[PDB]
């Protein structure tokens, strides 16, 4: 079965270079251009380029060129991108994907996405403040304030409080860290907040009480 | 390059509606378009090539028209799952271009937003910072406004917002205007409040408290 794995998420710091792997089994590896394209958070798509993995050939899009670089190792069947001179636009997570027609249908096929984050911030666990009710149901939740990189996860009372939860999507500061609030509503009649943050190892279940 | 324009940005359908979105082309590229879906976080799933040929598990409710400069896709009828971002794309000429999204999805009936006001945690202020959250739950549709007023003097900056997906059980939206400022100058004045506007209610509502 045609499969494409990525290599790992990455932070750099403004100027540094990226290498984005692309490893592909189930097909024919120098019969079909690779292609990469990214997505910055909450924008659409963009093209960087292909590279013919028979003959090692390459296309960019012009919006890169200079910067981007497309090569090839046959012998282990992977594909790499390198973005250097990263900016903070270059933010986005990158995709590594093919194209095929076996039997008689056109298939697609997609990498699972590396998330590059260009950024002068460090690795940093988040402070979680409560979110008190203040008097029929009441509401309340937890901020988790200053974090970097992405992702946090939240989740309430260790997992049994599913219903009326809205975890937000988080917002980046001027100060370069991230920031969410998570919420949740209750009947006016314990509530923990667990949020983990794997980047830092930073675990800390916080009560809320009014 | 060649621009891709879509339109409408977004739109409310439900289920069992057919769905048509547009696709124009800067210039004539044939028949060399194609359409993907994705939804958020997952890569995108390749719809359409050669402007009206499905790719392999494609449903056939999917289909694709144009030729040209203007371009089509049409849900016949649509069905839950389909409720995603749509783009086409140009392969007739390089750079590859793409659209910008069409976001479908679903429409319901309109909800007011329950409003409801935090003040900065001791735990925060011990710290030397202070956050102020506005909370908008459950409402519909999308659109919204938050302002907020220290003293009613109106606030400008150092207040950013968070808008929630639709909501998996009740297709609602929900808001987090956050307002952040110096613990000195939290001190330094006296009444807060968030005012919330949304075509769902009939005159702005406004949550306040008095503390600092
Ligand atoms: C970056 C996106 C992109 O543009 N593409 C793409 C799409 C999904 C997955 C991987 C690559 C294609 C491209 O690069 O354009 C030439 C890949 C080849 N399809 C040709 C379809 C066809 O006609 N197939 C049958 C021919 N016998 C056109 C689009």
């Known amino acids: 079965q045609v499969q494409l794995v990525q290599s790992g998420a990455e932070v750099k710091k403004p100027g540094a270079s990226v290498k984005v792997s692309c490893k592909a089994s189930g097909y024919t590896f120098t019969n079909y251009d690779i292609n990469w394209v990214r997505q910055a958070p909450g924008q659409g798509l963009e093209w960087i380029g292909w590279?013919?993995?028979?003959?090692?050939?390459?296309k960019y899009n012009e919006k890169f060129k200079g910067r981007v670089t497309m090569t090839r190792d046959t012998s282990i069947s992977t594909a790499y991108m390198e973005l250097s001179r990263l900016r903070s636009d270059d933010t986005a997570v990158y995709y590594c994907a093919t194209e095929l027609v076996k039997d008689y249908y056109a298939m697609d096929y997609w990498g699972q996405g590396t998330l590059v984050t260009v950024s002068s911030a460090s690795t940093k666990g988040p402070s979680v403040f409560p979110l008190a009710p203040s008097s029929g149901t009441a509401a309340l939740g937890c901020l988790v304030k200053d974090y970097f990189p992405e992702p946090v996860t939240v989740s309430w009372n260790s997992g049994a409080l599913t219903s009326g939860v809205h975890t937000f999507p988080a917002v980046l500061q001027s100060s370069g860290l991230y920031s969410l609030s998570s919420v949740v509503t209750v009947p006016s009649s314990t509530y923990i907040c667990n949020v983990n943050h794997k980047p830092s190892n930073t675990k800390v279940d916080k009560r809320v009480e009014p | 390059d060649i621009q891709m324009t879509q339109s409408p940005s977004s739109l409310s359908a439900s289920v069992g509606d057919r769905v048509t979105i547009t696709c124009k082309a800067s210039?004539?590229?044939?028949?060399?378009v194609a359409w993907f879906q994705q939804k958020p976080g997952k890569a995108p799933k390749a719809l359409i090539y050669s402007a009206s040929y499905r790719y392999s598990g494609v449903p056939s409710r999917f289909s694709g028209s144009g030729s040209g400069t203007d371009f089509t896709l049409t849900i016949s009828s649509l069905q839950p799952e389909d409720f995603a971002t749509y783009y086409c794309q140009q392969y007739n000429s390089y750079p590859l271009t793409f659209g910008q999204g069409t976001k479908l999805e679903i429409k319901r009936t309109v909800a007011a937003p329950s409003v409801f006001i935090f003040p900065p945690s001791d735990e925060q202020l011990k710290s030397g910072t202070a956050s102020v959250v506005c909370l908008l739950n459950n409402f519909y549709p999308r659109e919204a406004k938050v302002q907020w007023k220290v003293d009613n003097a109106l606030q400008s900056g150092n207040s950013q917002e968070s808008v929630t997906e639709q909501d998996s059980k009740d297709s609602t939206y929900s808001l987090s205007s956050t307002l952040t400022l110096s613990k000195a100058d939290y001190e330094k004045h006296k009444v807060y409040a968030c005012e919330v506007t949304h075509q769902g209610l009939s005159s702005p509502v406004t949550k306040s408290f008095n503390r600092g």
């Open positions: 210039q004539n590229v044939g028949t060399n």
């Open positions: 590279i013919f993995p028979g003959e090692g050939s390459t």
